[PDB]
Structure 1
Amino acid sequence: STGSATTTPIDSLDDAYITPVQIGTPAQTLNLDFDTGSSDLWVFSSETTASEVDGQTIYTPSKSTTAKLLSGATWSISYGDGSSSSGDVYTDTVSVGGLTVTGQAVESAKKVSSSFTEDSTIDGLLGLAFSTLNTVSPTQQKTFFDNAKASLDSPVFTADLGYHAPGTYNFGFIDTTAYTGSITYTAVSTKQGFWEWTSTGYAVGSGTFKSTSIDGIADTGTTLLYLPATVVSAYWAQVSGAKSSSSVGGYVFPCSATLPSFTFGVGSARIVIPGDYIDFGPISTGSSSCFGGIQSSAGIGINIFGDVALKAAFVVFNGATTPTLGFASK
């Protein structure tokens, strides 16, 4: 079987992407943030503290005839940006774009951090990293992808994120009309539970390509591109007036500047991020200082190929027994 769903940016800056997901019987449709950097499927629900809900659509397990409480199970997650949520666990039927999984763990939030409350457009997260990162205790739970794998035509899913436009997540098949050229596959390490791979180097604008190994993770759940300080300094050195701002928390640049493109290596292939993808607009309303889409990973401890990079490519997440990542131009 296969599944296909449209994913839509939540604002004019592509800060995140939401995908409709059907949960329960009869279906309750929630708009979830598909996150290849985490492995929990959690949702705002009828059990969430009412003061922590501000416009989100909630899952109501008591209205689903297929929902079952997973006795004694709890979950608690903390994200790299400091976000967190926690609650109890139901199992229920979950469908994505026609692809249905029965008995999926649906983690019901009793408490969420303020950054989720303030994001009225995201009803929850759907984790697509490896199941070893799932936070359910005492019995760890499988991801939607892991549960669907056996019935998929091919054990893959693909991410085709749009620049200021809708995109597509496909499960079980590779749409050969959605990219140009060939797909370049590269090895994945699962030792930390992430879709972790090694880029072969980078170039700034029309400069020379620098061959150098950059270990990082493919993370649809992270907005920006986080790279080592040496790389990020070399990029922003080419933007007149750009500087690292401690008060803002990263590199900013004059909004009137034109940004150079950024190229990253995948094996012998090259993925080019247009300079316009790196503009995240004014730091505050009316400001003439703009926030950059490429920032240093020094404080994070790991390099993150977030949406800024992934949306320049057609990305194949191959969940075969030896997992691989595929990149194509589009």
Structure 2
Amino acid sequence: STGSATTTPIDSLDDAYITPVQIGTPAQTLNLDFDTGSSDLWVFSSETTASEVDGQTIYTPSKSTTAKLLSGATWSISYGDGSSSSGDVYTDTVSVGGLTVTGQAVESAKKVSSSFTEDSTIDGLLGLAFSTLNTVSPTQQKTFFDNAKASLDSPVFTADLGYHAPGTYNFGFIDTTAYTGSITYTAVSTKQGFWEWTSTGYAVGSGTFKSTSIDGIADTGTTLLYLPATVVSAYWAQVSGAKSSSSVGGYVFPCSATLPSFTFGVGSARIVIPGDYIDFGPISTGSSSCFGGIQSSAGIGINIFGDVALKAAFVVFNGATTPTLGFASK
């Protein structure tokens, strides 16, 4: 089997991407944030505290003839941005782009933190990291990809995120028309539960490539590119007037600037992030200070190849017995 679904930016900045997902019988379609940095499929629901729902579409398990309470199971998750959610668990039928999994754990939110409430466009998350990170207790549950894998034509999914435009998540096949050149594959460590890999270096604009190992994660659920402070300083030093602002929470730059590109290495291959992809717009409405899309990872504990980086590539998440990642230009 295969599946193919379009993923759409939630706003004009590509702050996140939503993909429609069918849950239950008859189908209830929710727009979920596909997140290769986490491993829970959770949704706003009829059980979510009413004051914490503000415009999201909810899953109502009592209206699904295939929903079953997973007795005794609870979940609770906290994300790197400080947001969180928790609740109980159903199993139900879940389909993405024509690919159907029966018995998928659908984690129903009883509580969500303010940033979820305040974002009316995201109805939940669909985790695509390794199932060892799934938070369901006392019986850990498998991700949608893990459940689908054996049925797929090939044990892979691909992320093809657009810049200010829709893109595609495919399951079970590699669309050879969706990228240019060849796909360069690189080793993955699953020891932290992430799609963790080592970039071979970077360049800023037309500058020379610096060969240096940068361990980080391919994370579709993180907006920006978070890299070591040395790398980030080298980037922003090429932008007149750019500075790190403790009050804003990162590097800002004059909105009048033209940003240089940023290149990252995948083995001997190179992925070029155009400068425009690094512009996240005014820090507040009407400001002439703009927020940068490359930020320091120094306070995180891990480097994160988020959407800013991934949207410059066609990315293969290869879930073979020994997982690997593939990157192609497009």
Paired-residue identity, %: 100
Displacement of 1:323 in angstroms is 0.2
Displacement of 1:62 in angstroms is 0.1
Deviation per residue, 1:232-264 (Å, 9 max, x gap): 000000000000001000000000011000000
Deviation per residue, 1:111-166 (Å, 9 max, x gap): 00000000000000000000000000000000000000010000000000000000
Deviation per residue, 1:193-238 (Å, 9 max, x gap): 0000000000000001000000000000000000000000000000
Deviation per residue, 1:288-309 (Å, 9 max, x gap): 0000000000000100000000
Displacement of 1:39 in angstroms is 0.1
Superposition CA RMSD, Å: 0.3
What's the TM-score, normalizing by structure 1?
A: 1.00
Runs of 4+ in 1 over 6 A off after TM superposition: none
Deviation per residue, 1:24-52 (Å, 9 max, x gap): 00000000000000000000000000000
Q: Residues of 1 paired with 2:136 and 2:284: CA distance?
A: 38
Q: Residues of 2 paired with 1:328 and 1:79: CA distance?
A: 28
Q: Residues of 2 paired with 1:292 and 1:80: CA distance?
A: 18
Q: Residues of 1 paired with 2:221 and 2:209: CA distance?
A: 28
Q: Residues of 2 paired with 1:254 and 1:26: CA distance?
A: 51
Partner of residue 139, structure 2: 139
Deviation per residue, 1:265-311 (Å, 9 max, x gap): 00000000000000000001110000000000000010000000000
Deviation per residue, 1:63-93 (Å, 9 max, x gap): 0000000000000000011000000000000
**Secondary structure in 2 matching 1:263:** strand
Q: Residues of 2 paired with 1:293 and 1:150: CA distance?
A: 37
Displacement of 1:170 in angstroms is 0.2
Q: Residues of 2 paired with 1:181 and 1:221: CA distance?
A: 26
Displacement of 1:7 in angstroms is 0.3
Q: Residues of 2 paired with 1:26 and 1:202: CA distance?
A: 49
Q: Residues of 2 paired with 1:80 and 1:307: CA distance?
A: 15
Is 1:276 aligned with 2:276?
Answer: yes
**Secondary structure in 2 matching 1:180:** coil
**Secondary structure in 2 matching 1:58:** coil
Q: Residues of 1 paired with 2:217 and 2:207: CA distance?
A: 25
**Residue correspondence of structure 1 range 51-66 to structure 2 within 5 A:** 51-66=51-66
Displacement of 1:176 in angstroms is 0.2
Q: Residues of 1 paired with 2:98 and 2:232: CA distance?
A: 41
Q: Residues of 2 paired with 1:121 and 1:219: CA distance?
A: 20
Unmatched segments (≥5 aa) in structure 1: none
Displacement of 1:329 in angstroms is 0.3
Q: Residues of 1 paired with 2:190 and 2:306: CA distance?
A: 18
Q: Count the aligned residue pairs.
A: 330
Q: Residues of 1 paired with 2:242 and 2:34: CA distance?
A: 32
**Secondary structure in 2 matching 1:238:** coil
Q: Residues of 2 paired with 1:52 and 1:184: CA distance?
A: 43
**Secondary structure in 2 matching 1:165:** coil
Q: Residues of 2 paired with 1:164 and 1:80: CA distance?
A: 24
**Secondary structure in 2 matching 1:202:** strand
Q: Residues of 2 paired with 1:80 and 1:250: CA distance?
A: 15
Q: Residues of 1 paired with 2:97 and 2:301: CA distance?
A: 35
Unmatched segments (≥5 aa) in structure 2: none
**Secondary structure in 2 matching 1:260:** coil
